[PDB]
């Protein structure tokens, strides 16, 4: 059956009986850094199965007024087992991911979520001159950011989903690795993305490579609204490797 899937990573296995295939970002499967592209000279540490496993973030509630949600990687995993520990004890890190978004309802529910993985999603601020988004706002952790809620401080980033929070039109996000969760067809989305950057490895703490953006393009509707419909995200690092070991970095 082409609508079933089982994904095994380390000691974790995820299943779905209503998928819409899977997407491999830019057609490139994640792989370890080769000696021809490498630059840092010390031997990397490769945690393997203790880090390349599915980590489930906090669930979100989807209702008729939801405007969307976003998370940044690797930030969202900063407190996730061994993977999290490794990104703070090392200067450099490198990794790919398997993002699995879950959301089921019923054959009497309707709604559509656009699930996108954006590389270098540099957020914007609105009507605030040259003041840019502050560090703590773009590093929410596993809780991510719920569009349309925050208390307006100055370094607060844009909350306009139709402008991709960056000055570009939502309808064109499909140019990035993506999938849709159309309740009448599937109850999950699966994106496998490789490491994408202009350098072979980077700081896991000051730089977020990917951003997971989930926008409900078609309002959630049904005749049984009291029944809460959550959205759950499970992310698994792939080929994670770290370099430049030292004491553990403490942020903020």
């Amino acid at each position: 059956s082409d609508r079933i899937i089982q994904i095994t990573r380390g000691d974790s296995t995820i299943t779905s009986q209503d998928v819409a295939n899977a997407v491999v970002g830019y057609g490139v499967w994640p792989h370890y850094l080769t000696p021809q592209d490498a630059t840092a000279i010390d031997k990397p540490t490769q945690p393997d199965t203790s880090s390349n496993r599915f980590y489930t973030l906090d669930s979100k509630m989807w209702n008729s007024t939801s405007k969307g949600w976003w998370w940044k990687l690797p930030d969202a995993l900063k407190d996730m087992g061994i993977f999290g520990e490794n990104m703070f004890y090392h200067f450099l890190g490198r990794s790919g991911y398997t993002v699995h978004v879950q959301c089921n309802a019923s054959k009497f529910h309707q709604g559509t979520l656009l699930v996108v993985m954006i590389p270098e999603h540099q957020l914007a601020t609105v009507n605030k001159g040259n003041v840019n988004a502050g560090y703590k706002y773009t590093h929410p952790g596993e809780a991510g950011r719920e569009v349309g809620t925050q208390v307006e401080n100055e370094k607060q980033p844009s909350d306009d989903n139709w402008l991709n929070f960056d000055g570009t039109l939502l309808g064109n996000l499909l140019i990035f690795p993506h999938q849709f969760i159309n309740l009448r067809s599937n109850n999950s989305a699966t994106l496998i993305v490789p490491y994408v950057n202009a350098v072979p490895m980077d700081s896991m703490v000051r730089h977020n490579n990917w951003s997971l953006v989930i926008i409900p393009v078609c309002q959630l509707q049904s005749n049984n609204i009291s029944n809460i419909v959550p959205i759950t995200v499970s992310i698994s690092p792939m080929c994670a490797e770290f370099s430049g070991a030292r004491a553990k970095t403490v942020v903020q």
């Binding site: 059956s1 095994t8 390349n52 792939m238």
Partner: peptide, 13 residues
Amino acid sequence: QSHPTTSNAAPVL
């Protein structure tokens, strides 16, 4: 020894 997998063959189901 086994390895990570991604397929529509779901033995656990």
